[PDB]
């Protein structure tokens, strides 16, 4: 098939929908890592100042 629409829809067709806590879990892992980079800010050299 030459079409990128078949290719793309078959490729998005690979991964499924993860719902109702994996969304909030993505959000929680995201915010956790974020919180830890601002920890890394909290333990600063001149870089932050």
């Amino acid at each position: 098939t030459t079409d990128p629409v078949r290719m793309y829809m078959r490729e998005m067709g690979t991964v499924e929908l993860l719902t109702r806590e994996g969304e909030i879990d993505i959000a929680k892992r995201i915010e956790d890592g974020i919180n830890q980079v601002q920890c890394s800010v909290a333990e600063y050299p001149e870089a932050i100042t």
């Binding site: 098939t1 078949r6 078959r10 067709g13």
Partner: protein
Amino acid sequence: ETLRVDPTNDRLSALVEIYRMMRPGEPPTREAAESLFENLFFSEDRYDLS
């Protein structure tokens, strides 16, 4: 001799292969293959109504 070369003798394979000719590379789903097969050229929608 055809059966000795090829063993498919079922309708649902007929319908999946219907899908597959109609929607090649696309995943056959049964109401899709069947609604395809039917609604295309026996629904009132298509035969516009003229």
